[PDB]
Amino acid sequence: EYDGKEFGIGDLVWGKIKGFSWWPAMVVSWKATSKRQAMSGMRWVQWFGDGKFSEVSADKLVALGLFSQHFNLATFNKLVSYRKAMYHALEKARVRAGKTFPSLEDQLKPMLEWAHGGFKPTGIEGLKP
Amino acid sequence: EYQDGKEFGIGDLVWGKIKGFSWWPAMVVSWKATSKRQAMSGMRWVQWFGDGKFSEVSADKLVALGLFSQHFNLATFNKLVSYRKAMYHALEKARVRAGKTFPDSLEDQLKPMLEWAHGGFKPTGIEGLKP
Numbered sequence: 001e002y003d004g005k006e007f008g009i010g011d012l013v014w015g016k017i018k019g020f021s022w023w024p025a026m027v028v029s030w031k032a033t034s035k036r037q038a039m040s041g042m043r044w045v046q047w048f049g050d051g052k053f054s055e056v057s058a059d060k061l062v063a064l065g066l067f068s069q070h071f072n073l074a075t076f077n078k079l080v081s082y083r084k085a086m087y088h089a090l091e092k093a094r095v096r097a098g099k100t101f102p103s104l105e106d107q108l109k110p111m112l113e114w115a116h117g118g119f120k121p122t123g124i125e126g127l128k129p
Numbered sequence: 130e131y132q133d134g135k136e137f138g139i140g141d142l143v144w145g146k147i148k149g150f151s152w153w154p155a156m157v158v159s160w161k162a163t164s165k166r167q168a169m170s171g172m173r174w175v176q177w178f179g180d181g182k183f184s185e186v187s188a189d190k191l192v193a194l195g196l197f198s199q200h201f202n203l204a205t206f207n208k209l210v211s212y213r214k215a216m217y218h219a220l221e222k223a224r225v226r227a228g229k230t231f232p233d234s235l236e237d238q239l240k241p242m243l244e245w246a247h248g249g250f251k252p253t254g255i256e257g258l259k260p
């Protein structure tokens with residue numbers, strides 16, 4: 001923990017599992033999961049919004065920093081769970097990036113703008129553990 | 130729960146810092162107390178004294194309540210009755226845990242508990258605040 005592959009503990013990522021759009025998450029240690037060690041090539045991630053754990057292939061994870069590419073507007077409008085997930089993921093992104101902003105969709109607005117805009121001034125660097 | 134290599138576990142009395150508020154006393158709780166969800170790794174559910182609400186707070190924006198004089202905010206204390214009430218509930222919990230006793234308005238009961246806390250929780254020291 002953690003096989004040659006990408007991503008380590010604390011990284012903010014989008015992860016893709018069956019039945020769900022790309023979904024924001026944080027790579028965690030298997031010890032945080034109360035479950036089991038991850039198989040080689042896999043990563044435990046904890047999903048923002050519901051705090052649940054999934055073992056996901058490192059090959060189906062991308063940096064949260066690739067934001068606009070993987071943000072899914074339709075899902076965002078359809079599912080309140082996705083919007084909450086976005087809030088909590090960007091909230092963590094914010095704090096790590098020493099970021100400051102002035103309701104759910106109210107707080108989300110400057111967060112999303114900051115994300116879609118490249119996480120300036122820190123850039124992606126501000127999202128690292 | 131909370132096996133992420135960070136400080137603080139269930140029942141700990143802490144000051145927690147969130148946006149728009151002074152450092153505020155709280156108790157670390159299990160996510161099960163919250164009716165919400167598991168905290169993100171590196172974070173803790175805390176329940177704020179005074180209003181009993183739950184917030185998910187990074188363990189790095191938490192400090193032991195025992196570090197009292199450092200995080201007690203006198204301006205907030207003088208300004209907000211909610212903060213004074215929170216102090217009362219936080220310190221009463223600390224007091225019972227510490228095995229401390231003192232000899233009545235809110236501020237009347239608060240007075241020796243604050244002196245106690247501000248003086249370093251004598252004679253137990255901060256160790257007596259453990260759950």
Ligand SMILES: CCCN(CCC)CCCCCCO
Pocket residue numbers: 015016017020021023047049050052053054055081082
């Ligand atoms: C509505 C939120 C649902 N999210 C989906 C995120 C992709 C939780 C999925 C839980 C999967 C556990 C085992 O793999």
Ligand SMILES: CCCN(CCC)CCCCCCO
Pocket residue numbers: 147150153177179180182183184185211212
């Ligand atoms: C006046 C009392 C204020 N309390 C505690 C302040 C730290 C309000 C906390 C809001 C909880 C929402 C979830 O995060």
